[PDB]
């Protein structure tokens, strides 16, 4: 077994809620077709406010109802981010509005920036923020990003 080497930044406002979520989920699908040797994955946020942070209660809970674990700690997203990931996907049009600001600061950007959402088979274009949801909105929010990690995988896997 020998290929080459992907990455993917999952990227939105805070970093605690749904990218932990989607990093975890993506992660999980490459270990399980034993592909992770290949990939470099991350979350992080727009925001700075979280940093540190671990994510929310209701997104850890939501994973190990899945079977899944993370250790992740609020990071944000910075200019380097748009030089070395091939990818970063994002949850809503504002964390894409804001990609693209921050992007234009990057000369060689190499990047390419796109909405997770506009992998699902099912087109929710968008990933709605759980925050001030409850369980059930994480796990939809889980069920989307299942939906559009494999979708993505199966394209530039």
């Keep these: 077994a020998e290929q080459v080497t992907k990455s993917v930044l999952f990227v939105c406002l805070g970093n605690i809620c749904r990218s932990p979520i989607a990093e975890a989920v993506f992660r999980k699908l490459v270990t399980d077709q034993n592909i992770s040797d290949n990939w470099v994955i991350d979350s992080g946020a727009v925001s700075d406010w979280n940093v540190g942070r671990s994510p929310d209660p209701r997104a850890v809970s ?86 559009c990690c494999r979708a993505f995988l199966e394209k530039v896997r």
């Design 62 to 147: 939501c994973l190990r109802n899945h079977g899944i674990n993370t250790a992740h700690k609020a990071r944000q997203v910075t200019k380097e981010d748009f030089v070395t990931f091939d990818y970063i996907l994002c949850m809503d049009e504002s964390n894409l509005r804001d990609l693209n600001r921050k992007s234009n600061q990057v000369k060689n950007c190499r990047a390419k920036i796109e909405l997770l959402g506009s992998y699902d088979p099912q087109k929710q274009l968008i990933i709605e923020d759980p925050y001030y949801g409850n369980d059930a909105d994480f796990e939809t929010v889980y069920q989307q990003c299942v939906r």
